[PDB]
Amino acid sequence: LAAPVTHIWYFKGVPSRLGYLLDLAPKDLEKIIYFAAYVITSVDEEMRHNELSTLEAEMAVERKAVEDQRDGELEARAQKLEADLAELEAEGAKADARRKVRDGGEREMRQIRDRAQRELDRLEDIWSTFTKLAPKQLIVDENLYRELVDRYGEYFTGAMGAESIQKLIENFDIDAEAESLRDVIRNGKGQKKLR
Amino acid sequence: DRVLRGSRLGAVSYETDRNHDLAPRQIARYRTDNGEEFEVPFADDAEIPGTWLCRNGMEGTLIEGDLPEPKKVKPPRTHWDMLLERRSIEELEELLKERLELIRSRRRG
Amino acid sequence: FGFSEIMRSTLEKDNTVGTDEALLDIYRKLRPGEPPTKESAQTLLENL
Amino acid sequence: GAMLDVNFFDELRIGLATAEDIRQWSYGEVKKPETINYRTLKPEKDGLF
Amino acid sequence: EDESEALRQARKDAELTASADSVRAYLKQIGKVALLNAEEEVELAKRIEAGLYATQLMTELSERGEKLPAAQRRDMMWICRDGDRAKNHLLEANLRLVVSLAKRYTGRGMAFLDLIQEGNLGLIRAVEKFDYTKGYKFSTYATWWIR
Amino acid sequence: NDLYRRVINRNNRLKRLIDLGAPEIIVNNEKRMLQESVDALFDNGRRGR
């Protein structure tokens, strides 16, 4: 085979042995091995640690430049509304028809700041999902994963499919995992102990 | 539904199965480009071929180097040849510099 | 359905107003994975 | 364990086959989706047969 | 409040679904990229030819000659990268043409997605063989190789 | 022979696409098809139609 392929017996039949080994839900495992969602195979820690400070400085700078273009939009809409004031303050018409154009301009300003809120929430979500990055974490929205890849090509590796599953099985310590599991069954109780 | 009678495309011979006097054989040794070696028993009155298709699906050459292995052709259906068969070098050059002017006038004046 | 305690109870518990909103709801419960448009979501039940 | 299947058995152990076991069982790589030549009915080279 | 607000919410909820059939998943994957026109196809073809000549020239020069103009080498690699970007964009534009041609051969012999991927190979060959100097619509030339 | 032929066909086409150089949509669709073929070989009707 020119690309690795998982055995169907160890993934589909309940209980899913790949899911129990890697601690992945079956609906989040089928999405990996049938090419619907990416998966962070590995991540750096200390380079991430100092580049947290440097990259949050760069992120604040980029968001500040976004706010600079946003106040350019604010001032441009203010000058446009003052031009509408100059070209509607001496035209004899109805009391609301001379002001419905200004209300439409203010509605245009309201949707401009709504779009600014939308892109700032997008940038906030990108920074949040970099700051909460870990292995065995699915990333839906290929656009969002693409943005993480082209902005943060270092500090982590991600993949998609049975090659990623093979990489996760390689980066796996059965002895440490078994010590954690036996610690849980010695200490905890309930659903966590049954799991 | 029927009494259908079918045969696979081969015939069974039945002679004696003896193992005391056989035709003489000598073992060649081929090594691939994987660093893995295979042994094949040929006949005595048989010319040893230089390259044998081993059990890995890859061509293994002989382990005793004797042959001037040839200099066979590149597969000539590439995009560069399919471009050259309908274009000219000066046309590609003027298009290259015209495309170069875009990055030069984008990065600088 | 003026006589039916069950029907008026379910109209109290429907948690959905708006014909277009209910139509989008049944479109999402019926067709999974398709981007809903207004005319296709309207004519889906009629064509079905 | 032996695989000639003469009747000297003690066990029958089943495991999980690795790729280096599969390409050690095999006798060659089948690499064409051909079975039998349509006119002469002889098994094709590097096919399934 | 039904002016694309609840429609947008249901659109994102449908975008985050599963869609467990492979044909439906491939159609939803190829539906994202928008279509093109003649001038866009012309400029993509010109970028393809420029990038191909750039990488051919750089290989045949660096085989026997070493030079270091930094800006020139950087823009040469820029041309080589963005030519392949243009080629990938052209293929992803014409995937719907491939599917629309291959949908009429179903039911006899092969599957659906085998037909679609064979049309994909034919489309790659048509993009290789395309010429813009004769000045025609790209679909009329590519239909021959796809079929 | 049909299941083995589908696996061998899709694997050869994938080798052609990878060594040719194709975009990610085509290559990922080919890999998903190869995975579904091997799954249908080992157990038919387990995941999907």
User: Measuring CA to CA, how many Å separate D24 from each of A50, B30, D16, D29, E86?
Assistant: 49, 17, 14, 11, 45
What is the identity of the amino acid at A20? Y
Name residues whose C-beta falls within 8 Å of residue E7's C-beta, 6 or more positions apart in sequence: C24, C36, C37, C38
Distance from CA of E62 to the nearest CA of B (A): 17
Contact assessment for residue E41 and residue E138, using Cβ atoms and an 8 Å cutoff: yes
Q: What share of chain D is helix, strand, coil (3-state, %, to 5)?
A: 15, 5, 80
| Chains touching D, CB cut-off 8 Å, 3+ pairs | B, F
- Give the Cα separation of E144 and E142 in Å (integer): 5
Are E53 and B103 an interchain contact pair (Cβ–Cβ within 8 Å)? no
Which chain F residue has its CA at the smallest distance from D46's CA? F8
Which residues of chain B have a CB within 8 Å of the CB of E46?
Answer: 95, 99
Which chain E residue has its CA at the smallest distance from B108's CA? E71
Strand partners, D36: D43
Strand partners, B37: B31
Enumerate the H helices of E4-136 as residue ranges.
Answer: 5-15, 22-30, 38-62, 70-102, 113-129
A122-149 per-residue burial string, b: 16 or more CB within 10 A, e: under 16: eeeebbebbeebebebbbeeeeebebbe
User: Measuring CA to CA, how many Å separate A113 from each of A62, A72, A108, A116?
Assistant: 17, 12, 9, 5
Interchain contact E4–A (C-beta under 8 A): no
Question: How far from the centroid of its chain's Cα atoms is residue B10's Cα?
Answer: 30
Interchain contact D32–F (C-beta under 8 A): yes
Query: How was this one solved?
Result: cryo-EM
In this complex, how many residue pairs, one in chain E and one in chain F, have their CB atoms less than 8 Å apart? 38
Q: Resolution of the experimental model in angstroms, please?
A: 2.9
Q: Is the peptide bond before A15 cis (omega within 30 degrees of 0)?
A: yes
Contact assessment for residue A3 and residue A163, using Cβ atoms and an 8 Å cutoff: yes
* B–E touching, 3+ CB–CB pairs within 8 Å: yes
Contact assessment for residue B95 and residue E53, using Cβ atoms and an 8 Å cutoff: yes
Contact assessment for residue B62 and residue B50, using Cβ atoms and an 8 Å cutoff: yes
Are B80 and E52 an interchain contact pair (Cβ–Cβ within 8 Å)? yes
Which chain E residue has its CA at the smallest distance from B95's CA? E50
- Give the Cα separation of C41 and A148 in Å (integer): 35
Interchain contact B11–D (C-beta under 8 A): no
Measured in degrees and rounded to the nearest 5, phi and psi for residue A43 equal -155, 145
The pairing of strands A38-43 and B51-53 is unpaired
Which chain E residue has its CA at the smallest distance from C25's CA? E10
Name residues whose C-beta falls within 8 Å of residue E57's C-beta, 6 or more positions apart in sequence: B96
Q: Is E79 helix (H, G, I), strand (E, B) or coil?
A: helix
Contact assessment for residue E126 and residue E146, using Cβ atoms and an 8 Å cutoff: yes
Comparing CA positions, the residue from A149, A159, A148 lying closest to residue A126 is A148
In order, the DSSP letters of E110-147 are S-SHHHHHHHHHHHHHHHHH--SSS---HHHHHHHHH-
Interchain contact B104–E (C-beta under 8 A): yes
Q: At E80, list the tokens.
A: 């080589």
Distance from CA of D28 to the nearest CA of B (A): 4
- Give the Cα separation of E93 and E44 in Å (integer): 11
Interchain contact E120–F (C-beta under 8 A): yes
What is the identity of the amino acid at B11? A
Exposed, middle or buried by CB within 10 Å (0-12, 13-18, 19+), for A92? exposed
Comparing CA positions, the residue from E41, E27, E147 lying closest to residue E91 is E41
Distance from CA of C20 to the nearest CA of E (A): 7
Measured in degrees and rounded to the nearest 5, phi and psi for residue E17 equal -85, -170
Interchain contact A25–E (C-beta under 8 A): no
- Give the Cα separation of E143 and E119 in Å (integer): 10
